[PDB]
């Protein structure tokens, strides 16, 4: 049944004016906002926690710098099968019909983060909304 | 030529969520044309049970009929090249973004739209909804 | 409070594929369909009844011929102040933001008819939906 | 330069009707930028009564506060040239198609969005919603 | 009442990815493209000619600079009452429902030029499309 | 991985008023116009060259006729992995989410051509934009 998932709207969505576009696509699939924060600039330690599984990758520091280059919005979304369905909505830059498929064309600057599992979800929600 | 007719139901959840034009617009933009259309403020359960007769022995059969009579429905006959299979692809499923259910639905039951899935289904569903054959 | 109004989607909306576009705009303003009929070709006497107040005008026969040149949809819409609000949504070809303002550019071929008063509404609903 | 900040509330009827992104998108497309934003699953009535204090003596005052706490709200500080008056025009009213209320709302109470109507209103409403001035 | 009119799509439209959005609003109102040129950077002479009437105004030089800061598209559009209609479609940054009304918020960067009279239309068409 | 690719917007897009819709989908994916020509009626030679690989197929002549039955736009687009990405955006009349997937239902009238390889892209760019 109901799941909650963590979504980040990335700084490129703000620069390109696609924040409502991305949010609108999740809204139209009937997912509801449980929690939301706007960060004019997200603290670097939060981004590094969020991406900690990536700490050894070559792209790690650069992606963090990107994630801190403009605003982000963190959202907890709720709905039936939210984790997997919001992941599919995110998609990838090769898959038309998805957010990244229609609107992104970059390895790094790809508009949206969504939790990919139950464990990452629980962990990511606790990073951005620790009051709970 | 390659011309076919198919049957589409707009389900009560579409009226509930104000998605009726969005769904029809998606079919319209693919160049399919309305041939007949009826608005049912509430559909006779008899008609629903016929429409879903192949499903009469499943657990979900009664809950679904219930939902199907819980608000309005629109039944539409559409026409165009390869209409049955193309409108079916448009309908898609709740897992495939880009399709109607993919973009707009999130439930096994409340899924906004029905399209005929074969030439045989279409003839039969059209007969159910537009008996004036 | 609640009113009902009569709407015709005209044959030019079918030819130009704007049926859902027009209907969508009324839907987004929170008006509900009470009754609807599709007419592959509307009987001429219905069109002539519908436009009877116009019977002496120079455009009368030509407009009827147009109205019979392709399909029409007649709809009874319900909502708060439906007559006047749907009229304003229809607008005219000079008023951006309205249906005719955004999508039409013709004296005759103007996509949509809406009832303009309580009396015309009651009368027009009885023409297209006489079962009541 | 001509830079201003304004306060916008997305009302509970927007969440109800799934119009939140549509409204925000209309402000986004006019090139206004979010400066601060908060999501309230339910807003303290105290905050609403302050926000609508100039209205405390009207018949509709209590019914409106009721509605304002009947579901979520988002409060947003927007920034851009002439932001107060331009976002106010975007909001418009239920009689003017082309504006947010014009296209999407049909009620005197449930009207989807509030925008500050003056420089004085904005400073005060921003203070209410984002007391961390 | 068939007319042709000249439209310029300004560099801010390319910057903000609003090109198709703007052209679509004109298309949806049933106007047709009669000719079109894409300029990666317009010759400054063309811009000075185009805004000649404004050569004495204080914003003239900055505006010319703006108009050469990115690509522009020059379009000749045709349709009934095209000059007046496309001008209304263009609108102003105050009134919603128009291109500028919905999408612009600046006295200089306002996305679209449209001819405002029969004379300026003849003139501007000859500036951008001299081959007639 | 910056590439240029050639896109043709076909006469059925003008007929159905889908020009901006199609161009917008490419724009929204962050591809840029590098050059563009509008042809009220393309020289048949250009069309024959363009579809040379198909000169032996049964649909060759009808297709050439179709391609000259109304306006076309030829566009050179640039961006990361542009040839492959715009091809996917183009898609096919079976799979929703693409231009053809959403908007076309014909084996001939399918709205958009996009180059399918590095070689055809060089070639087709030289056909429509010989000045390089
Ligand atoms: O080569 C890469 C791979 C990933 N990323 C960034 O790091 C994030 C997480 O990487 P992952 O491969 O898990 O992508 P995702 O799960 O978000 O699709 C991506 O979304 C990118 O923004 C990057 O900058 N370079
Ligand atoms: O577990 C289920 C499966 C089916 N349905 C309903 O019954 C219809 C027919 O079921 P089917 O599996 O054939 O789905 P469809 O072909 O419509 O995609 C569906 O559209 C649902 O509305 C349901 O309520 N519960
Ligand atoms: O000169 C005219 C005036 C009107 N009409 C048609 O007749 C309808 C009714 O005329 P009216 O002036 O009442 O326009 P409306 O009330 O629909 O705005 C219009 O919508 C047009 O389709 C026409 O063909 N020629
Ligand atoms: O008769 C009324 C008038 C006002 N309102 C509510 O109170 C708010 C403030 O009223 P106002 O007349 O100032 O409208 P606004 O400035 O918001 O357009 C409105 O947005 C409505 O939500 C109401 O419920 N009933
Ligand atoms: O104070 C001003 C007024 C005008 N303009 C620019 O000059 C153009 C022509 O000015 P005009 O007042 O004629 O505007 P328009 O007729 O295009 O609305 C405008 O579109 C703006 O881009 C400007 O830069 N500063
Ligand atoms: O049976 C056919 C197949 C192709 N075409 C046309 O010829 C073009 C090139 O054919 P191809 O199979 O290469 O299609 P594409 O690569 O563009 O998908 C298509 O876009 C169609 O417009 C046609 O008219 N009849
Ligand atoms: Mg990952
Ligand atoms: Mg089935
Ligand atoms: Mg009238
Ligand atoms: Mg007020
Ligand atoms: Mg001027
Ligand atoms: Mg090919």
mmCIF file of C-alpha atoms in Angstrom, chain D residues 4-129:
data_model
loop_
_atom_site.group_PDB
_atom_site.id
_atom_site.type_symbol
_atom_site.label_atom_id
_atom_site.label_comp_id
_atom_site.label_asym_id
_atom_site.label_seq_id
_atom_site.Cartn_x
_atom_site.Cartn_y
_atom_site.Cartn_z
ATOM 1 C CA UNK D 4 10.212 43.445 -4.768
ATOM 2 C CA UNK D 5 9.173 40.549 -2.563
ATOM 3 C CA UNK D 6 5.596 39.361 -2.133
ATOM 4 C CA UNK D 7 3.680 36.754 -0.136
ATOM 5 C CA UNK D 8 1.635 34.028 -1.810
ATOM 6 C CA UNK D 9 -0.568 31.414 -0.131
ATOM 7 C CA UNK D 10 -1.621 28.292 -2.036
ATOM 8 C CA UNK D 11 -4.975 27.488 -0.468
ATOM 9 C CA UNK D 12 -6.388 24.027 0.629
ATOM 10 C CA UNK D 13 -8.673 23.864 -2.434
ATOM 11 C CA UNK D 14 -5.526 23.700 -4.641
ATOM 12 C CA UNK D 15 -4.371 20.538 -2.873
ATOM 13 C CA UNK D 16 -7.861 19.148 -3.001
ATOM 14 C CA UNK D 17 -8.105 19.719 -6.776
ATOM 15 C CA UNK D 18 -4.480 18.840 -7.623
ATOM 16 C CA UNK D 19 -3.724 22.371 -8.901
ATOM 17 C CA UNK D 20 -0.647 23.236 -6.857
ATOM 18 C CA UNK D 21 1.936 22.903 -9.653
ATOM 19 C CA UNK D 22 -0.357 24.622 -12.171
ATOM 20 C CA UNK D 23 -0.564 27.720 -9.944
ATOM 21 C CA UNK D 24 3.157 27.785 -9.092
ATOM 22 C CA UNK D 25 3.988 27.150 -12.771
ATOM 23 C CA UNK D 26 2.034 30.222 -13.809
ATOM 24 C CA UNK D 27 4.133 32.342 -11.408
ATOM 25 C CA UNK D 28 7.340 30.539 -12.458
ATOM 26 C CA UNK D 29 6.697 31.166 -16.204
ATOM 27 C CA UNK D 30 6.391 34.920 -15.537
ATOM 28 C CA UNK D 31 9.980 34.809 -14.247
ATOM 29 C CA UNK D 32 9.360 35.172 -10.513
ATOM 30 C CA UNK D 33 11.660 33.304 -8.139
ATOM 31 C CA UNK D 34 10.988 31.511 -4.853
ATOM 32 C CA UNK D 35 12.859 33.124 -1.991
ATOM 33 C CA UNK D 36 11.347 31.146 0.895
ATOM 34 C CA UNK D 37 8.633 28.506 0.977
ATOM 35 C CA UNK D 38 6.961 26.477 3.743
ATOM 36 C CA UNK D 39 4.548 23.605 3.601
ATOM 37 C CA UNK D 40 1.883 23.499 6.324
ATOM 38 C CA UNK D 41 -0.098 20.232 6.535
ATOM 39 C CA UNK D 42 -2.454 22.298 8.635
ATOM 40 C CA UNK D 43 -1.815 25.931 9.469
ATOM 41 C CA UNK D 44 -2.315 27.299 13.025
ATOM 42 C CA UNK D 45 -5.607 29.208 13.019
ATOM 43 C CA UNK D 46 -3.789 31.973 14.896
ATOM 44 C CA UNK D 47 -1.612 32.578 11.788
ATOM 45 C CA UNK D 48 -4.649 32.631 9.483
ATOM 46 C CA UNK D 49 -6.484 35.115 11.763
ATOM 47 C CA UNK D 50 -3.450 37.396 11.684
ATOM 48 C CA UNK D 51 -3.115 36.989 7.903
ATOM 49 C CA UNK D 52 -6.799 37.908 7.499
ATOM 50 C CA UNK D 53 -6.943 40.403 10.428
ATOM 51 C CA UNK D 54 -8.174 43.288 8.238
ATOM 52 C CA UNK D 55 -11.225 41.054 7.670
ATOM 53 C CA UNK D 56 -12.004 40.239 11.346
ATOM 54 C CA UNK D 57 -15.340 42.121 11.281
ATOM 55 C CA UNK D 58 -16.909 40.597 8.115
ATOM 56 C CA UNK D 59 -19.581 37.899 7.860
ATOM 57 C CA UNK D 60 -17.252 35.554 5.923
ATOM 58 C CA UNK D 61 -14.324 35.861 8.371
ATOM 59 C CA UNK D 62 -14.998 32.658 10.345
ATOM 60 C CA UNK D 63 -16.066 30.425 7.427
ATOM 61 C CA UNK D 64 -12.890 31.447 5.635
ATOM 62 C CA UNK D 65 -10.518 30.684 8.521
ATOM 63 C CA UNK D 66 -12.317 27.305 8.731
ATOM 64 C CA UNK D 67 -11.608 26.623 5.079
ATOM 65 C CA UNK D 68 -8.024 27.887 5.503
ATOM 66 C CA UNK D 69 -7.384 25.168 8.111
ATOM 67 C CA UNK D 70 -9.317 22.386 6.301
ATOM 68 C CA UNK D 71 -6.234 21.020 4.487
ATOM 69 C CA UNK D 72 -2.638 21.941 3.582
ATOM 70 C CA UNK D 73 -1.302 25.356 2.581
ATOM 71 C CA UNK D 74 1.967 26.512 1.043
ATOM 72 C CA UNK D 75 3.285 29.987 1.845
ATOM 73 C CA UNK D 76 5.845 31.350 -0.578
ATOM 74 C CA UNK D 77 7.927 34.473 -0.770
ATOM 75 C CA UNK D 78 8.428 35.410 -4.388
ATOM 76 C CA UNK D 79 10.912 37.860 -5.812
ATOM 77 C CA UNK D 80 11.090 39.817 -9.047
ATOM 78 C CA UNK D 81 10.523 43.196 -10.711
ATOM 79 C CA UNK D 82 7.232 44.718 -9.607
ATOM 80 C CA UNK D 83 6.437 41.342 -7.951
ATOM 81 C CA UNK D 84 3.573 42.521 -5.704
ATOM 82 C CA UNK D 85 1.424 44.041 -8.415
ATOM 83 C CA UNK D 86 2.359 41.528 -11.172
ATOM 84 C CA UNK D 87 1.671 38.397 -9.088
ATOM 85 C CA UNK D 88 -1.567 40.082 -7.946
ATOM 86 C CA UNK D 89 -2.615 40.449 -11.596
ATOM 87 C CA UNK D 90 -1.707 36.799 -12.186
ATOM 88 C CA UNK D 91 -4.029 35.883 -9.299
ATOM 89 C CA UNK D 92 -6.803 38.024 -10.797
ATOM 90 C CA UNK D 93 -10.410 37.088 -9.977
ATOM 91 C CA UNK D 94 -13.025 34.474 -10.844
ATOM 92 C CA UNK D 95 -14.448 36.735 -13.585
ATOM 93 C CA UNK D 96 -11.265 37.317 -15.611
ATOM 94 C CA UNK D 97 -10.139 34.432 -17.809
ATOM 95 C CA UNK D 98 -6.386 34.386 -18.363
ATOM 96 C CA UNK D 99 -5.582 34.820 -14.670
ATOM 97 C CA UNK D 100 -5.213 32.001 -12.149
ATOM 98 C CA UNK D 101 -8.619 32.515 -10.467
ATOM 99 C CA UNK D 102 -10.098 33.377 -13.866
ATOM 100 C CA UNK D 103 -9.069 30.069 -15.411
ATOM 101 C CA UNK D 104 -9.316 27.768 -12.404
ATOM 102 C CA UNK D 105 -11.623 29.074 -9.644
ATOM 103 C CA UNK D 106 -15.362 29.461 -9.411
ATOM 104 C CA UNK D 107 -16.117 30.420 -5.784
ATOM 105 C CA UNK D 108 -16.018 33.543 -3.520
ATOM 106 C CA UNK D 109 -14.227 31.605 -0.787
ATOM 107 C CA UNK D 110 -12.419 28.653 -2.389
ATOM 108 C CA UNK D 111 -10.245 30.549 -4.809
ATOM 109 C CA UNK D 112 -6.950 28.655 -4.823
ATOM 110 C CA UNK D 113 -4.501 31.495 -4.145
ATOM 111 C CA UNK D 114 -3.716 34.637 -2.090
ATOM 112 C CA UNK D 115 -1.193 37.318 -3.157
ATOM 113 C CA UNK D 116 -0.245 40.479 -1.191
ATOM 114 C CA UNK D 117 -1.974 43.543 -2.624
ATOM 115 C CA UNK D 118 0.462 46.287 -1.502
ATOM 116 C CA UNK D 119 4.025 46.946 -0.274
ATOM 117 C CA UNK D 120 2.541 47.300 3.223
ATOM 118 C CA UNK D 121 0.517 44.035 3.021
ATOM 119 C CA UNK D 122 3.608 42.160 1.757
ATOM 120 C CA UNK D 123 5.940 43.261 4.587
ATOM 121 C CA UNK D 124 3.265 42.290 7.104
ATOM 122 C CA UNK D 125 2.276 38.959 5.536
ATOM 123 C CA UNK D 126 5.902 37.941 5.032
ATOM 124 C CA UNK D 127 6.441 38.712 8.738
ATOM 125 C CA UNK D 128 3.474 36.524 9.687
ATOM 126 C CA UNK D 129 4.622 33.522 7.623
#
